[PDB]
Structures are given as C-alpha cells and as structure tokens.
Design a protein around this ligand. Structure first.
Ligand SMILES: [Cl-]
Ligand SMILES: [Cl-]
Ligand SMILES: [Cl-]
Ligand SMILES: [Cl-]
Ligand SMILES: [Cl-]
Ligand SMILES: [Cl-]
Ligand SMILES: [Cl-]
Ligand SMILES: [Cl-]
Ligand SMILES: [Cl-]
Ligand SMILES: [Cl-]
Ligand SMILES: [Cl-]
Ligand SMILES: [Cl-]
Ligand SMILES: [Cl-]
Ligand SMILES: [Cl-]
Ligand SMILES: [Cl-]
Ligand SMILES: [Cl-]
Ligand SMILES: [Cl-]
Ligand SMILES: [Cl-]
Ligand SMILES: [Cl-]
Ligand SMILES: [Cl-]
Ligand SMILES: [Cl-]
Ligand SMILES: [Cl-]
Ligand SMILES: [Cl-]
Ligand SMILES: [Cl-]
Ligand SMILES: [Cl-]
Ligand SMILES: [Cl-]
Ligand SMILES: [Cl-]
Ligand SMILES: [Cl-]
Ligand SMILES: [Cl-]
Ligand SMILES: [Cl-]
Ligand SMILES: [Cl-]
Ligand SMILES: [Cl-]
Ligand SMILES: [Cl-]
Ligand SMILES: [Cl-]
Ligand SMILES: [Cl-]
Ligand SMILES: [Cl-]
Lengths: 216, 216, 216, 216, 216, 216
C-alpha cells in the first residue's frame, strides 16, 4: 500500500490475515469489510496479491474475474483512449486492465496515485472487487429473508440475530431492506411476542421490541 | 487512525484483536474500554471497519445502528447545514451521516481532524458508538443489582466481586451507584459478615470491609 | 504513551499483555513491575485503559478506585486551585481528578507532560495506581512471613524460595524486612540446616547459607 | 528488500511465512502469488535466501536451479560483456550470474537498483524464479483438465471448483484456457445440469451457469 | 532502551521473551547471553524491569540482589562522592545505587548515557547482574566436570555434548578450562575410543577426535 | 545489526527464530541460509549472541569455536599489528579476536563498519561462522551420496529428493557435484527408469528425466 503518500510493501501478516479470513469465514458478509480494512491504501498489485493468494473457492474467484472484466469494459467504454504520444511530465490515461493491475506496472500505479489531481486506481479496482464479492456473498447465502421465522420456544434475541444476518446477505437496496424490517420482522415472530409487538405500534424501535419480548 | 498528526491505516492486529474480543467476551463491560483503546485516534472509516468486521450479534449491531442514527439526527437538528458554496481554503460542515462515515470520504475526515480549529469527527462518532454499546451492555446483562446477595458459606471477596460486576453493568448515574454501594452491599451480606459490617459504621472503606470479613 | 517527546497510542499487544498478566497471575507481586513496564511513558488515559480493560477482580478494582480517590483528595488538599482565568501560553493547574484522567482531556495530559517545566501527570497517577496495587497484593497474600518454616525433608533452596516469596508480599519497610531476613530465616530452618547455619554466624550471606545447607 | 528507495533486511516473519507456505502448500498454484508478495522489492540475495531456506523438495529446487541457469545463459547471450575498465561514477553491466545473486555483492545489487536509469536485478531474477516455479507447479499437478467431469450427485459449484483449480494448474495460454472454459466445462457437466446449461447458450456467464444449475 | 542515541520503552515482547526464558530454561548457561540480547542498550530501569518481572526463583533473585549490593559498595569505595553543588550544564556523579537504578530517575540515567564523555550506567549495572547470574548458574549446576565419563555403549558425540555442557557451567578461567579439555576429555572416554584418542596425540582437534571415534 | 547505516539492536523475534531453527532442524543444510538471513547486517556481538543463545549441541558449538579460532589465527598471520599509537580520526586495525567480537567493543565494531573505506567485521566473522557450520553439517550428515539408490517400487521424484538432499550435505566442489549429478544419479536409478534414462542421453535435463520416469 501507500501511506501518508509513501509506498509500502504489503505486510506478511496482512496477507496471512486475509488468507485465514477466507479459509475460516468462506464468503460471509463480514469478509467484505475485513477485505477493505486489509487493503487500505493498497495498489492494484496488492489487491491482485490478496485475490491470487486465495487457494480454493476457484468458482467464486472466477466469478470475481468476470465481474472485474465487466467493470473494466464499462470503464473502457466510458473512458476511450486518445491517440497521440504521452508528453513529458504526464502519464498515459489508465485502461480498464491497468486499473485491474494486469497491464500496468507498480511504478505506473504509484504514479497515478501520487501525482497531483490523481486517479485512485487502487480504490477503483477495490470497488470492482467489492462489487464481485457482493455478487458471491449473495449467491452463496443459503437462506432467504422471507423464510426466517421465530420458533415458539425461540428467544426473541436469537430470532433477531438470524433475521438480520440473513438480511445482511440479502440483495436489496436500503429502501427495500427498510420495508423488510418494518414488515417481515414483526409478522414472522411467534404468536406471543407477535401479539406483544403488534401492541407497541409501527414506530417501535429495535431496542423497544427486544425489551418487550425479553420476558416472552 | 491518525497519530502525531499523520494518518495511518488500521493495523491487522488491532482489527483482529477487536474481533476476538467481541467473540470471546460478548458484551461484557470491559469490551467498551477495549474498544476505545483499539480505536485511539481512529477515523470514522476505522470505527465502521471495527463494527462491520463483527460477525454475529446482528441484533446488537442493528441496535447500535439505530442509536447512531438517533445521534446523527440530533446532531443535524443542532447543526443545520447552511446554504451557499464552500469557499477555497475551507471545508463543508459535517452532517450527522458524515460523522458516522457513511457519507464522507476518508480525505474529508482527515481534513476535518487535521485542520486548524478542527472538528474531531472520529471522537464524536466514537461517543455515539460507545453510547449504543452501553445500551447493549445494559440490556444484555442478565443480573440485577438488587438480587446479588452473599451466600452463607460464600467468602466475602467473591460476593464483592459479583456485586461490583453487576454494578458495573447497571444503568445508573454515579450518585445512584454510590447509594447502591452504601446501602445494598452491607444489607445483602450474610448475617455473620453483615453484623460485623454493621459494627464498623457508615464511613467504612471497601478495604476495611473486606479485611473485617476476611476471617468470616 | 509518549516516547522521545511524541505521543503514541497504546499498542494492542501491550494492552493484551497486561490483560493476560492479570488473568494468569492474579495479584502476585511480579504483576506490579509488569504493569510499570507496560505503562512506560503512559498518559492517564492509557493507565485508565489498562485498569478498565480488566474483567473480573472487581472487588480489587474497586479498592484501587478508592485508593486513587484518596490520593487525588490528598493532592487537592496540597494543591489548591487558584481563582482567575488561565492566561494565553499557559495551562490550568491539574486537579486530582485530572491526574486520574477522569476529568482531563488527552490534549491536556499531553500538554502538561510535553510543556517546559512539566507536570508528569502520568507518573503521578501511575504512583497512585501502584500504591493501590500494593494494598491489593498485600491483602490477597494468603501466607504470613512468620509461618514459613523449613520442612525436615525439604531442601534448603525450596525453603528460601517460599520464604522470599512470602517476604516479597509482606507489608514492611526495608528495615523490617532486613530484620526478618536476619532473624526468622535461620530460626525457622530445620534442625540440621539450622545448626549448620548457626555455625556460620550473623554475617553470613545468602549464597554462603545456601551453599552450606546444599548437602543437607 | 528496498522500500521507498531504502534497503531493508528481510524480516524474520517474511522468511518464516514463506517457509511455512512451502511446507503446508507444497507446490499449489497460490504459492506463486504468495512468493511474489513475500519478495516485494527484494534483492537477489533476498530471493536466494527464500529459495535456500526451503528444506526438502530438493528435486524441485534443483529444477528451479536449472531453469535459473537457462535464463541466465539466455541473458548472457542477449547482453554480452564489453571489454574495458569501468569508469568512475559507473557500474559494470550485470551478468546472468550477477542477476541470480551468486556472483554479485549486496552493494552491487543495491547500486543497480537505486542508480538512475536502473537495472532491476531483483525483478529480473524474480521473473526467472517464477518461471521455474511455474514449471514445477505444472509438473507436480496430478490432474488433467480433460479428466475433470461432474458427478451425477455432485453439486455444480463443487464441480466448478475442481475444474478451475485444475485449469489454474494447466500449461496453456489465455486463449487456450478460454477455449477450455467455453468448450469442456459445459460438455463435462452431468446430464441434468448439462442440458440446462446447453439451453442457456454460448454467451452465458459463470454466474448465470452456477445460478441455473444451483437447484440441479 | 536507547537506540541510535534515542530512548525507547522496553517492548512487551522483549519482556515477555525474557520471562518465558526464565520459566522454561531456569538458570541454564544460555540464559545469560539471552539476557544480554534482550537488554541491549537498556537503562537501569529496564534491567530492574526484567529482574523484577521474574516470579519464583526468589532465592536466586535475592542472591542476585546481594551481588548487586556488593558491586555497588565496591563502586562507592572506588568512586567517592565529592562535596559541593552541581554546576549548570553538569550532572552529579552516580553512586552505586544510582547505577542499580534504585536511587536514580530515568532522566538521570538517560542524561548519563547520552551526554558527551558519558558514563554507561546501563552497561555497568548489566555487568553486575551478569556477575550474579554467573554465581547462580554455577551454584545451580548439579554436575561436576570431573564426573562426566563416557559410557561403554555411549556414542562419542553425546559424551562430548555432556562434557562441554557441564564445562560451560563450571567455575573456571579459560586457562583452567583449557587444562580440563586437554586432560579430562580423553581420559574419561571409554576404552575403545580412549585408546583411539590416545593414538592421535596431544595436538588433536575436537573435529579430529569426533571423526576418529565416529565409528567407535 | 546496522541498517541503512544505522545501528539496531537484535530483535527478540530474530533471536527466537534462530534458536527455534537450531532446536527443530539440528544441523540440516537449510540452517545455514537461515542463519545468514537472521544475521543480515549483524555486528560480531549479534553473531556471538546467536551462537551463545544455542543450548545443547555443545560439541558442535565447540567445533565452531575451534574453527573460528583457526580463522582468527590465519587472519592475524596475514594482518600483523603495527606498532605505534593510533592517530586521531583513525581506528586501530582489527585483530582476529576483534573480528570474533571477543576482544572488541560494540562501538569499535560500529566504527569499523560505518567508517569510510570500512572493514566489514561482521561479514568476515560471519564467513568464519558459516565455514564452521559447513564443517558441522558435513560431519553430522549420516548418509553418503554413493549409497543413495532408487528402490524398485520407489517413485523417481522421491529418489531425486533423497539424492539431492544428500548431495546438498556432501563435501565437494561444484565440479565434483556436477560429476556426481551426471554420473551417479542415472546409474543408481532402478532398472526400468534407469533404462529409460539411458535412452535419453548425456545432455538430458532434470525436468526431462523426471518427466520421462514419471509414469515409471
Ligand atoms: Cl508484518
Ligand atoms: Cl481458501
Ligand atoms: Cl461457501
Ligand atoms: Cl496467480
Ligand atoms: Cl472514478
Ligand atoms: Cl430474548
Ligand atoms: Cl500489525
Ligand atoms: Cl462475533
Ligand atoms: Cl450476549
Ligand atoms: Cl458491511
Ligand atoms: Cl462536539
Ligand atoms: Cl474473603
Ligand atoms: Cl502491536
Ligand atoms: Cl481478569
Ligand atoms: Cl486473587
Ligand atoms: Cl470502564
Ligand atoms: Cl509531584
Ligand atoms: Cl538445596
Ligand atoms: Cl519481523
Ligand atoms: Cl519444505
Ligand atoms: Cl508435491
Ligand atoms: Cl544454501
Ligand atoms: Cl529487462
Ligand atoms: Cl450448487
Ligand atoms: Cl512489541
Ligand atoms: Cl519464573
Ligand atoms: Cl533451578
Ligand atoms: Cl518489584
Ligand atoms: Cl567503568
Ligand atoms: Cl558419534
Ligand atoms: Cl520483535
Ligand atoms: Cl538446541
Ligand atoms: Cl544432530
Ligand atoms: Cl555464553
Ligand atoms: Cl577481507
Ligand atoms: Cl515420480
């Protein structure tokens, strides 16, 4: 990565941490924040390093490759290369593959990131990667939000844990997720807690809901 | 984080330490100091990194989200955005969502924190987070302070351990906690140690109390 | 902490090291040096961080709180606040609670420590903490120095280990501890080694004593 | 290594990380990215350090030696040494063995890398090493891409994992690997999923294929 | 410690390393080099930190205290304090107890070490400590060099291992240790290897001796 | 060590790494590269630190001492000390024992290494140590290269592993090792693979040999 802006090689414990995360957590939602944290200020070479280090899950890594290629293609369509030689004191405009790090040197990436009025190639590539990771997380989620229902003997807190876990994996905008929270959560609770929740009303917070069904 | 003031990426072992703390300790009181220590000088992006890295406890993390949104809303009510373009050499006033890091870039956060006469967005957001964490710790505490009572064969020291643990989780100001210490502790001790404690008087320190019932 | 003088956030492995030390070693004497070593150059915020991170032993942590409050009160009596506004280029005199870090900001602590003709708030608070830790170590020691006696089949070296361990926990000045070393150690040895030790005389060193009873 | 450009000794945890990787992962594809990441900015002395540290797999390490010697020989043929004494302010042109680090000092390597209009000896040597590593990975792969076939009860995702693992080990250009992906993957699937995949058509993405046979 | 010269707090892993070394290795010879390595450039406060951190072996730590006091007393006899006030730009001459760190501040130690024409208080104290450690290692060694004898079925290499281990613990100058090597080693070997060793002669090296009795 | 050139104390994890390497790997060939890597830029004090830290293998450490003394003696014969006082701005020429670090201070070593037109005492001493380590590795190798022979059911790759391991331990120049590779390897293979190898010819590479007997 580059830290203020000075280039640093990716540390062994950062890379190991990411590898271990992929092994232990598969493609759980929390891996995406983790990834970002382990790739803070990272060059495209660092990001490719993290992805390539993963052994196994090669179907998911291939899907990630196809997503990255789609994003690179869209970038190329939006940003067409301009003919003519590069002038001194200037650098060539980055193609999609340069952002992915496959066709650009480390010095070129450093140059784009450090130069005044910069192009943050690492952050763009990072966005593409996180997009594909979201695709993978959503496909690999077994459960659907509609199916989560509270058991008759199940404590409300556990039910809310399951519900919001599944919700975190769901493919939906924040408006849709809001609708799910304010529609399905109370509807799918068990009858005792469901009645008690209905009694609270439409504006009840999560804290009030969990406190109300705490005894239940 | 930012260390003197120079921005640093959150270290892998800091993040791992926080994750492990959440796994092992759930929502015990000591997690809140720990959090602070692991977030010293942290940007809103770092704080969101720590929260988002948590897998599981999604009910608590959702409660935390609602608390953060309430605090952001109160901030927005107190600090209304002013119309007009931002001048050169100046930065826009931060909204509630910018303090939470959801709507502000890393460079904007760094700019607010580093600039002369700064706005410490990381510390404000950190306060909101710790507020919600206090809500969660208090709700997730099974015991109540009134119920802690010394067993007849129970050594006084163990009883004081239980008492002050439960007290640490309790929802009360320092005046109320003072009243609890000076009222309930001696009252709920077992009869031998309770008599001996009554003999000491109202001004007896904790050290004197534990020394007096040490043989008992 | 602050290292030369430049402020640094408390490292995750320092804090973890202290937590582990409290868990494994309880309140053995060696925890107090350890504490100091883990708090070298630490601000009051760092010290509070270390204390607050401890889970359990809440009776001892409460005793520590009462000791810190007594020391803060004595400081306040010795150093009375002076009326009048603080001038530019100067900082307010620290109250007891400011030294304990409960009522002072991190920037205020840094300012006191870094400024020319400084007030070392971290070292003062550290002294208070170590004082309370000594109270706790002494109360939590089960054994008394008078009771340590050499077994008939017990090797002298083991007996000296037990003796000086208990002595290290004892509540006594160096003059009293000297008297204990030169009175009780030889007196409480077993008859064979006790006779041999008496034969050496009053000025015999520990090395000579252990060498003399090595065969015994 | 050298980090910006300042020379650094190879860290103990980098070297240990590489050694552990060779032990645990043998010669799986992911070891080659790992190697690169652990050798970022490394001098030829660092690279030789990493290779020489490996215990066991001496057949593979010998193959690696022969590949490095072939690459050094080709370099020497392309770059013939020029007679005449080296001038002040200039350094001798590197031979193949100098790039491999066997015949060049650390100061010479540092000089080539740091000097203006530099020769990156570490990156050239690194390319040779990675070339030989590719030879070893390909020879040590037991499976062939043609043999990977989906089981009748085998979930499609597992089959795609096996397929792309074997493909990653395969000795083929990206055009050939493209042909394999678009020819053999759908052909070697089981009849239910194979029929469903045929129904999608030639332009179907991996995500669409896995989603389509997800129920299957 | 102080590293070039800039003061650094003792790291948590250095201290932990020393503690673990004392636990696992007791007072084996190799602990003394280890100690030195963990105390490189250390102030008297750091050295006291390392000694005080040790739990257990309190007889040995007390012996160490008596040795340090003897060395401090000899220093005081050689270096008598001179009456008169300390001038500006100058520092007081260190007493024995100041070198031991018991009566000197950290700033005083730093001042002695950093100042031009310095007094290396840390290295002097370190010498005293290592002297007492040698006393302890020698007393705690069970074996004597005269007793080490080769078994009839014992391989020569194992016998040389035992011999030089015991020799390393022995209390003797290098001239005496030379005499022991050139007298007792060949004399105490078993008859087959002893005869073969006698045949080599008085000037035979250790390598020649081990090679000669390798088959034996 | 010294890193660019600035002196650094040997890290705890470097030393621990070396100790663990000696414990686990004994005197396998790979320990010698490891040693070098852990001693990069190290002073003679650091090298002595690493050697002295080893517990056990005292026969080998003694052999190492005799080798170092022989190398120091040869250095002294080649470099005779010159009579006359050392001038200001100059340092005394190093004797053999100074290079070994037994008779030279840390400041003297630093001075030799840092000064313009330097004497690299650490690298010279390091060469002596590695020489003695080679003696030890060769003596402690049980197997001889002539004895390695392929089993009838033994896969060729395993046989090449054993062969080149033993070869790595062998006492021979690169010309002799070349002769062994091109004479004994094919000769000692089993008859099926030996016939197939003979069919390839004298110029066959290792890769071709292993590929040819892969089915065999
Ligand atoms: Cl690292
Ligand atoms: Cl994996
Ligand atoms: Cl999965
Ligand atoms: Cl790859
Ligand atoms: Cl953009
Ligand atoms: Cl519940
Ligand atoms: Cl880290
Ligand atoms: Cl968790
Ligand atoms: Cl919980
Ligand atoms: Cl997230
Ligand atoms: Cl504010
Ligand atoms: Cl008690
Ligand atoms: Cl750390
Ligand atoms: Cl604890
Ligand atoms: Cl306890
Ligand atoms: Cl707290
Ligand atoms: Cl004071
Ligand atoms: Cl004894
Ligand atoms: Cl390291
Ligand atoms: Cl290996
Ligand atoms: Cl393999
Ligand atoms: Cl080697
Ligand atoms: Cl090139
Ligand atoms: Cl599937
Ligand atoms: Cl550390
Ligand atoms: Cl111990
Ligand atoms: Cl012992
Ligand atoms: Cl102590
Ligand atoms: Cl001196
Ligand atoms: Cl032998
Ligand atoms: Cl370290
Ligand atoms: Cl060992
Ligand atoms: Cl061995
Ligand atoms: Cl030694
Ligand atoms: Cl030389
Ligand atoms: Cl084979």
């Amino acid at each position: 990565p580059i830290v203020q802006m000075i280039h640093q090689a990716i540390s062994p414990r950062t890379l190991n941490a990411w590898v271990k995360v992929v092994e232990e957590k598969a493609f759980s939602p929390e891996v995406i924040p983790m990834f970002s944290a382990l790739s803070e200020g990272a060059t495209p070479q660092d990001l490719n390093t993290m992805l390539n280090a993963v052994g196994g899950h090669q179907a998911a890594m291939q899907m990630l490759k196809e997503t990255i290629n789609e994003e690179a293609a869209e970038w190329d369509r939006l940003h067409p290369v301009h003919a003519g030689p590069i002038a001194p004191g200037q650098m060539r405009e980055p193609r999609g593959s340069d952002i992915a790090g496959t066709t650009s040197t480390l010095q070129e990436q450093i140059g784009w990131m450090t130069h005044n009025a910069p192009i943050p190639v690492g952050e763009i590539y990072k966005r593409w990667i996180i997009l594909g990771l979201n695709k993978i997380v959503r496909m690999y989620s077994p459960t659907s939000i509609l199916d989560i229902r509270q058991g008759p003997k199940e404590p409300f807190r556990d039910y809310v844990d399951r519900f919001y876990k599944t919700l975190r994996a769901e493919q939906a905008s924040q408006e849709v997720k809001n609708w799910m929270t304010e529609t399905l959560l109370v509807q799918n609770a068990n009858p005792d807690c469901k009645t008690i929740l209905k009694a609270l009303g439409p504006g009840a917070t999560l804290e009030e809901m969990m406190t109300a069904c705490q005894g239940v």
